Motif scaffolding. Sequence first.
Motif, mmCIF file in Angstrom:
data_model
loop_
_atom_site.group_PDB
_atom_site.id
_atom_site.type_symbol
_atom_site.label_atom_id
_atom_site.label_comp_id
_atom_site.label_asym_id
_atom_site.label_seq_id
_atom_site.Cartn_x
_atom_site.Cartn_y
_atom_site.Cartn_z
ATOM 1 N N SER B 13 59.583 106.861 -9.702
ATOM 2 C CA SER B 13 58.287 107.203 -9.759
ATOM 3 C C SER B 13 58.293 107.865 -11.463
ATOM 4 N N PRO B 14 57.234 107.601 -12.183
ATOM 5 C CA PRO B 14 56.739 108.362 -13.407
ATOM 6 C C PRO B 14 57.088 109.771 -13.261
ATOM 7 N N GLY B 15 57.669 110.424 -14.255
ATOM 8 C CA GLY B 15 57.737 111.977 -14.174
ATOM 9 C C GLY B 15 59.183 112.321 -13.863
ATOM 10 N N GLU B 16 60.102 111.127 -12.982
ATOM 11 C CA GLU B 16 61.097 111.600 -12.593
ATOM 12 C C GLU B 16 62.393 111.038 -13.690
ATOM 13 N N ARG B 17 63.415 111.281 -13.275
ATOM 14 C CA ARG B 17 64.845 110.872 -13.969
ATOM 15 C C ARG B 17 65.208 109.650 -13.909
ATOM 16 N N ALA B 18 65.934 108.968 -14.783
ATOM 17 C CA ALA B 18 66.422 107.827 -14.525
ATOM 18 C C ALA B 18 67.884 107.745 -15.440
ATOM 19 N N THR B 19 69.005 107.154 -14.763
ATOM 20 C CA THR B 19 69.940 106.977 -15.494
ATOM 21 C C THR B 19 70.347 105.683 -15.410
ATOM 22 N N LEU B 20 70.648 105.008 -16.567
ATOM 23 C CA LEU B 20 71.213 103.514 -16.849
ATOM 24 C C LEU B 20 72.410 103.522 -17.271
ATOM 25 N N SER B 21 73.312 102.584 -16.580
ATOM 26 C CA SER B 21 74.620 102.446 -16.978
ATOM 27 C C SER B 21 75.008 101.317 -17.620
ATOM 28 N N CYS B 22 76.117 101.424 -18.746
ATOM 29 C CA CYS B 22 76.753 100.373 -19.156
ATOM 30 C C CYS B 22 78.072 100.260 -19.545
ATOM 31 N N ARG B 23 78.727 99.444 -18.826
ATOM 32 C CA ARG B 23 80.131 99.448 -18.763
ATOM 33 C C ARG B 23 80.754 98.328 -19.775
ATOM 34 N N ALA B 24 81.929 98.475 -20.212
ATOM 35 C CA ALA B 24 82.710 97.680 -21.171
ATOM 36 C C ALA B 24 83.902 96.925 -20.419
ATOM 37 N N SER B 25 84.093 95.791 -20.778
ATOM 38 C CA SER B 25 85.477 95.213 -20.452
ATOM 39 C C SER B 25 86.799 95.740 -21.263
ATOM 40 N N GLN B 26 86.326 96.547 -22.122
ATOM 41 C CA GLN B 26 87.480 97.004 -23.059
ATOM 42 C C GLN B 26 86.781 98.106 -23.803
ATOM 43 N N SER B 27 87.769 99.152 -24.302
ATOM 44 C CA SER B 27 87.095 100.582 -24.877
ATOM 45 C C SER B 27 86.088 100.238 -26.170
ATOM 46 N N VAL B 28 85.251 100.895 -26.157
ATOM 47 C CA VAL B 28 84.223 100.863 -27.370
ATOM 48 C C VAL B 28 84.167 102.227 -27.956
ATOM 49 N N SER B 29 84.180 102.235 -29.423
ATOM 50 C CA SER B 29 83.865 103.336 -29.968
ATOM 51 C C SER B 29 82.486 103.897 -29.869
ATOM 52 N N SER B 30 82.290 105.155 -29.897
ATOM 53 C CA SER B 30 81.161 105.855 -29.710
ATOM 54 C C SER B 30 79.890 105.194 -30.556
ATOM 55 N N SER B 31 80.567 105.081 -31.652
ATOM 56 C CA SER B 31 79.929 104.795 -32.955
ATOM 57 C C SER B 31 79.505 103.396 -32.832
ATOM 58 N N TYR B 32 79.881 102.476 -31.916
ATOM 59 C CA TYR B 32 79.688 101.111 -31.792
ATOM 60 C C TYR B 32 78.972 100.880 -30.781
ATOM 61 N N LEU B 33 78.527 101.940 -30.061
ATOM 62 C CA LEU B 33 77.497 101.633 -28.798
ATOM 63 C C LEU B 33 75.957 102.029 -29.185
ATOM 64 N N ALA B 34 75.094 101.094 -28.752
ATOM 65 C CA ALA B 34 73.767 101.665 -28.996
ATOM 66 C C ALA B 34 72.839 100.892 -27.893
ATOM 67 N N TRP B 35 71.665 101.833 -27.692
ATOM 68 C CA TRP B 35 70.587 101.127 -26.613
ATOM 69 C C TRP B 35 69.395 100.703 -27.089
ATOM 70 N N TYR B 36 68.794 99.761 -26.824
ATOM 71 C CA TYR B 36 67.460 99.349 -27.162
ATOM 72 C C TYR B 36 66.577 99.387 -25.961
ATOM 73 N N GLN B 37 65.287 99.151 -26.221
ATOM 74 C CA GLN B 37 64.047 99.176 -25.351
ATOM 75 C C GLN B 37 63.307 98.055 -25.712
ATOM 76 N N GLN B 38 63.164 97.084 -24.715
ATOM 77 C CA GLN B 38 62.200 96.077 -24.965
ATOM 78 C C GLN B 38 60.862 95.844 -24.114
ATOM 79 N N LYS B 39 59.922 96.351 -24.638
ATOM 80 C CA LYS B 39 58.428 96.593 -23.671
ATOM 81 C C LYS B 39 58.107 95.024 -23.594
ATOM 82 N N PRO B 40 57.339 94.692 -22.561
ATOM 83 C CA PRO B 40 56.793 93.272 -22.354
ATOM 84 C C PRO B 40 55.957 92.896 -23.546
ATOM 85 N N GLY B 41 56.258 91.639 -23.918
ATOM 86 C CA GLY B 41 55.341 91.187 -25.040
ATOM 87 C C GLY B 41 55.898 91.605 -26.541
ATOM 88 N N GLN B 42 57.050 92.667 -26.505
ATOM 89 C CA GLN B 42 57.405 93.030 -27.937
ATOM 90 C C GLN B 42 58.737 93.022 -28.169
#
Lengths: 122, 104
Positions: B13-42
Motif C-alpha cells: 500500500s501507498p504510505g507504507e515502507r518498501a525495501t528493495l534488495s540488490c546483490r552482487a556476484s562480487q564485492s562492489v565499492s559503495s562509490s560504484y553502486l547506484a539506484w535508478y527509478q524508471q516510471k512508465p513511459g519515461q
Amino acid sequence: VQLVQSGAEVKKPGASVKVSCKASGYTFTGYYMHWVRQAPGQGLEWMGWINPISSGTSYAQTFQGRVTMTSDTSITTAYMELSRLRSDDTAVYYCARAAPFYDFWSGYSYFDYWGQGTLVTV
Amino acid sequence: IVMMQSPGTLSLSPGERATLSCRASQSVSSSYLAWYQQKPGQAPRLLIYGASSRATGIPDRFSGSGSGTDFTLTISRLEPEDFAVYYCQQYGSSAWTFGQGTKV
C-alpha cells in the motif's frame, strides 16, 4: 541540464541507425556521454561512451565492432551509430551524462542525467 | 559481474515502507553502486549514488545503504509516483552493469 534525443526510427535488418543527443545547460566537454539500450521488456544495457573533448570512446564488448560513437562540440551534440542492425536491436536508446574518469568523487560510476529515449525498430 | 535484484515484483500500500534488495556476484565499492527509478513511459532517473547519497531533486523519503555484495534501496513512505521500476547499477572493470530491475 537537458538531453534531447532524435525521434523514433524504423529500419530494416542490415541497415544502420544514427541517434543524436543534443546537450545543453552544462559544459559539454566536461562530461562523458554514455549510451544505454533498453529492449522491450528488458533492463538497461550499457553500450559505450564518448568523450567530446578528445572524441575518445569505449564500447561494451556486446556492441564493439558494430557501434560507432561520435560528437560535435560546436552544436554540443553526441551521436551513436549502430550498424548491421538485427531484429534484436529493437530497443529504446538513451543518452546519459556522467563525469569523466578524472572526477575525484567517482561521478563517472553513475549516470546523473538521461535524455528521452529514442525508439529504434528493426 | 552479475547484479541481482529482489524481489522481481514488490507490492504494498501507498504510505507504507518498501525495501528493495540488490546483490552482487562480487564485492562492489559503495562509490560504484547506484539506484535508478524508471516510471512508465519515461527515461530512468538517478535516485541514489555512492550506495547512500541522494541525487539532486530526490526526496529524503529515499535512502540507500549497504556494502560489499549487499545493497538496499528504502522508500520510507510510498507515493503513487513511487510505483515504478527500480534498477541497481554497478561500475567496475571499465564497464557499467545494471540489474534486471524490480517493479514496485
